């Protein structure tokens, strides 16, 4: 039942709308990453709200958890796409936004991209199954909370516990759980690096001709600084 649901709600293809028939430029690449982010956010929200037990969460905590975990969720899914679609040879942000090393360099996000490429390879090295991927991705949504607590922390704690239980079941073991939790933990530092880069870019957006969509700008200026300032922190296993 649980896996039936995760499979059923898994987002379909999302395109960036990038113009690949034009020479690469920092401005165009980042405007496309931003637009792609705005597009993926719409899908992540619909996905999250259809997850088993998500409605157990207080209304206010629902959108907050989604926004805090957004980058991590996107990174994990992109890593999986890169692995399944191009065997980690390139970063598959979208069918029309695939990054080779030149674009990784041009985007000024090289270090972050190489780490995501490594993440992509780990899906292969660790032989992560599509089902482990689905359960791990859902667990990522419940892996970052505010120090001052959510409106109802208890409902969040129960939900997170239940998703870990589902991972236990899919695994069924100790060695596998160790591998998967280590992989999950590795997503956080990458998201942090992207958060920092994105935050800095928004602040100087008017100087580099980069366009930020409405929702992205709000999340970056309101929620991301809470993470960067330590008010909102990831829940690591290790
Ligand atoms: C620079 C930026 O546009 C910022 O996007 C944000 C994404 C989430 C967030 F909370 C704040 C900003 C970006 O990183 N976009 C982006 C677009 C797509 C994907 N993707 O499809 O996985 C990613 C990725 F997660 F890889 F890094 C990143």
Swiss-Prot record:
Residues 1-238 are annotated as: Interaction with CCAR1. Changing residue 111 to N: In prostate cancer; somatic mutation. It comes from the Eukaryota. The record marks 218 as: Interaction with coactivator FXXLF and FXXFY motifs. Changing residue 92 to C: In PAIS and prostate cancer; partial loss of androgen binding. Belongs to the nuclear hormone receptor family. NR3 subfamily. This is Androgen receptor. It comes from Homo sapiens (Human). The lineage of its organism: Eukaryota, Metazoa, Chordata, Craniata, Vertebrata. The chain holds residues 673 to 918 of 920 of the full protein.
